[PDB]
Design a protein around this ligand. Structure first.
Ligand SMILES: [Cl-]
Ligand SMILES: [Cl-]
Ligand SMILES: [Cl-]
Ligand SMILES: [Zn+2]
Ligand SMILES: [Zn+2]
Ligand SMILES: [Zn+2]
Ligand SMILES: [Zn+2]
Length: 344
């Protein structure tokens, strides 16, 4: 592992890792090609506007980390980095990916969090070894039909983009376990989500969601569902069929009630329900045997069913800013003597 270039260049065939981060580099010197055995190249937190063609000489390069630079595109020579497995272009100014991105056949991770991408390159389909794709904080409104060919992709990040519609192409990504779609403008969650049988974590925080599809019930491997900061008025009964669900974040919505089918969520440990319009909770709330945390701060609750006493594992319960009388607060305290309860 080398941190100084001048020193790396005096003994070129010995360098394996090169870290030129925070060195105020405007350009990557062309003499960089002399490092024939280079495996990982770290050029983060510099002011690089382009990469020179001499990167073609770096045949053994497995990792290229260019986090926080001023890159606008990648050179055609990137196609010669046949052994490249990780390419990090985070916090740059990329408007487009060159067609040569499709030539990096051994790529596993492509990190593009925070750029200026308006479309995703159609040559993404050639990246058959790609397992993680981060396209967060860009200006995407759609996904190319060619992304449907990435059957082995496991993680996809699409938070902070311009998605007014959920891209149906996601439905073909059969091996996805993680999907981030936070901070978008999605109003409808279509049934294409139900095709993701291996999906474990789904993040849809800060969208404009009104309805969840009934096909959500097919998501049997789903452990985290984040629907916070949406427009949900009704939770379909099918949400109760998410057998593996451990965390459900429904804070900051417009829910009036919870379906009685919530009783089927035997693995649920954490439920966030603050800032809703809840006037009543079903007596079936008491069947949530594994529930540890429950927050209902800022709702319209005047009472709780006696069946809350069945929540034997409940450790924390936030009840602030509701419509409980001093008599109700006293009654609720008696129902849950092993639970930490907050009223004010
Ligand atoms: Cl992300
Ligand atoms: Cl973020
Ligand atoms: Cl909450
Ligand atoms: Zn060349
Ligand atoms: Zn990211
Ligand atoms: Zn971000
Ligand atoms: Zn196409």
């Amino acid at each position: 592992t080398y941190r100084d270039l001048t020193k790396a260049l005096q003994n070129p065939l010995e360098v394996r890792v090169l870290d030129l981060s925070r060195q105020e580099l405007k350009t990557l010197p062309i003499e960089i090609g002399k490092l024939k055995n280079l495996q990982r190249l770290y050029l983060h937190y510099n002011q690089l506007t382009v990469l020179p063609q001499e990167i073609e000489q770096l045949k053994n390069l497995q990792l290229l980390y260019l986090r926080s630079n001023r890159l606008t595109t990648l050179p055609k020579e990137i196609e010669q980095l046949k052994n490249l497995q990780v390419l990090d272009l985070g916090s740059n100014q990329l408007t487009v990916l060159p067609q040569e991105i499709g030539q990096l056949k051994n790529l596993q991770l492509l990190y593009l969090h925070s750029n200026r991408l308006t479309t995703l390159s159609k040559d993404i389909e050639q990246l058959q070894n790609l397992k993680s794709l981060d396209l967060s904080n860009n200006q995407l409104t759609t996904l190319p039909n060619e992304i449907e060919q990435l059957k082995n992709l496991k993680s996809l990040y699409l938070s902070e983009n311009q998605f007014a519609t959920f891209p149906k192409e996601i439905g073909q990504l059969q091996n996805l376990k993680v999907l981030f779609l936070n901070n978008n403008q999605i109003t409808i969650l279509p049934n294409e989500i139900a095709k993701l049988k291996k999906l474990q974590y789904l993040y849809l925080s800060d969208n404009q969601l009104i309805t969840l599809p009934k096909e959500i019930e097919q998501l049997k491997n789903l452990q985290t569902l984040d629907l916070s900061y949406n427009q949900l008025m009704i939770l379909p009964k099918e949400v109760g069929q998410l057998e593996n669900l451990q965390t459900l974040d429904l804070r900051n919505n417009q829910l009036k009630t919870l379906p009685k089918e919530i009783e089927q969520l035997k693995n649920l440990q954490t439920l966030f329900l603050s800032n809703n319009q809840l006037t009543i909770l079903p007596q079936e709330i008491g069947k949530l045997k594994n529930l540890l945390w429950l927050s209902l701060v800022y709702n319209q609750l005047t009472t709780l069913p006696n069946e809350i006493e069945q929540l034997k594992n409940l450790q924390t319960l936030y009840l602030n800013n509701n419509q409980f009388s001093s008599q109700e607060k006293k009654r609720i305290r008696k129902l849950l003597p092993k639970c930490q309860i907050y009223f004010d």
